[PDB]
Design a protein around this ligand. Structure first.
Ligand SMILES: OC1(CNc2ncnc3[nH]ccc23)CCSCC1
Ligand SMILES: [Cl-]
Length: 167
């Protein structure tokens, strides 16, 4: 039993809600919140910009030190950093950005990072400004993640379409 509330159950381990991931994180304070990161951990917009703003830019400061030490992530890769005021940890995961020409096949590799964590609050990878089809992202999530994932979908119209079309 956990403290996530109001989710629709899609499968044994995947749940979905119409919610702002920032507000969800502030309420639940989960062990792991997933960021929709880019390889440079430049949290300018989308989910990343919103999560960073909620940390008063502390996420960006920590991320800049991480990159200065380690260099960029790989597309499909991840790193674990602090969750600041939002969660214990933030798992920064880089899905392919279709608006950059990146291979959508890397979406499965990105979701594999979730399997290293028993429970996560997450957005749909490569959705929104990363330009992939969110219906496709949900399918890859369900077919790849085996740990317990609570998906927050900001857009109510999109949430309803994802539910209604789910196979
Ligand atoms: O959910 C997405 C990604 N974007 C966000 N998701 C959750 N919380 C968020 N807060 C700010 C942005 C944001 C992908 C699925 S379709 C609707 C958009
Ligand atoms: Cl977005």
């Amino acid at each position: 039993v956990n403290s996530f509330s109001g989710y629709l159950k899609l499968t044994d381990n995947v749940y979905i809600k119409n919610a702002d991931i920032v507000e969800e994180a502030k309420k639940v304070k989960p062990t792991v919140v997933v960021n929709a990161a880019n390889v440079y951990l430049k949290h300018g917009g989308g989910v990343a910009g919103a999560l960073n703003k909620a940390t008063n830019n502390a996420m960006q400061v920590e991320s800049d030190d991480y990159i200065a030490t380690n260099g960029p992530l790989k597309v499909g890769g991840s790193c674990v950093l602090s969750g600041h005021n939002l969660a214990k940890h933030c798992l920064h995961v880089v899905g392919p950005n279709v608006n950059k020409g990146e291979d959508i096949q890397l979406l499965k590799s990105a979701y594999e990072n979730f399997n290293q964590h028993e429970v996560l609050l997450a957005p749909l990878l490569s959705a929104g400004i990363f330009g992939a089809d969110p219906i496709h992202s949900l399918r890859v999530c369900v077919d790849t993640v085996r740990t317990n994932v609570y998906l927050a979908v900001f857009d109510k119209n999109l949430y309803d379409k994802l539910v209604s079309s789910f196979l």
